[PDB]
Ligand binder design. Sequence first.
Ligand SMILES: Nc1ncnc2c1ncn2[C@@H]1O[C@H](COP(=O)(O)OP(=O)(O)NP(=O)(O)O)[C@@H](O)[C@H]1O
Length: 344
Amino acid sequence: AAAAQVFDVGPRYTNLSYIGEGAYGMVCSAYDNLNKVRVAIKKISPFEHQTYCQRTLREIKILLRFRHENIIGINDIIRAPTIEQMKDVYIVQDLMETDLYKLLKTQHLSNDHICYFLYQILRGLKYIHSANVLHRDLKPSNLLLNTTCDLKICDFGLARVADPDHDHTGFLTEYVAERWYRAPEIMLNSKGYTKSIDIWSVGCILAEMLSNRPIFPGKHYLDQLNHILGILGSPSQEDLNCIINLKARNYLLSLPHKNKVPWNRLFPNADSKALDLLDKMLTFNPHKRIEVEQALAHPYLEQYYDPSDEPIAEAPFKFDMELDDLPKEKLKELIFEETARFQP
Ligand SMILES: Nc1ncnc2c1ncn2[C@@H]1O[C@H](COP(=O)(O)OP(=O)(O)NP(=O)(O)O)[C@@H](O)[C@H]1O
């Protein structure tokens, strides 16, 4: 077994090079001795933990169903031929040279790159939302790029089927997705079961592409709201009237008045069309927040916008995957069945 621990991707995939740690394993580039191209392989070792099996199954089911230029595909899956022998799963993907997080740490983006990246993020997100799926973890590290600036959305581990009828919850309800890209309603009254939570995350990414730093870098759950409201200012009476939960409403009413900080103050060299779209994506009230199809049609993106070339999903997910309380053993059996089509 080739080692890097065991990275047992058989004879086909050779010349392994450690390109990071992952969720439930490590990631390597490798030479595909068949297709004579380098590839990424993610070793996943999740069968110990019911949570790890849930995220692994959800991610495999979604990425096998999706087919889109701006969403990472699965080219291959390597696992043992029997459930008993299966400890690790290896997911083979196109090799991408970098990610937007690594890029923002090191590179000034031109207005043309910001425009093109945002276009490709929304084009992929249109397809995801069209499939009745919410990503729920959009952040720079989950946007891969290659040397010609092609962008692919990855990491569907926290993705869910949209369920707006069941989105409402209490104040300060605990959440999983990265704090800095969390929509204000998450801290207030939302489980994050609506498409508007992804649009908030995209708006945070846009702001981060304009400055190379996170726009709302909260140090904890409730500091996150301090940050958002320091820029958007105090929510309007109308926007408060949409929050019926007394704990969330009275919290907001307890805060001192703050006027909006205008985007042109924060980003004085930004394209004014970019700031108009940013404003529409970072709307406090999720009911007023721009939707993915309206974002694509915004004047900022007019050099790229072509809805005939922005495909939607053939086969939407109609109901959620009832993985909530399956024994890890049933989830290992579902992962086994979902990966069967790659077996010789
Ligand atoms: N197809 C790919 N090509 C190249 N690098 C990749 C690829 N997929 C993931 N990576 C790298 O592996 C890590 C990201 O893994 P990803 O598939 O986004 O899931 P994750 O569980 O979010 N991983 P991470 O948070 O980075 O530890 C980062 O080091 C990426 O830059």
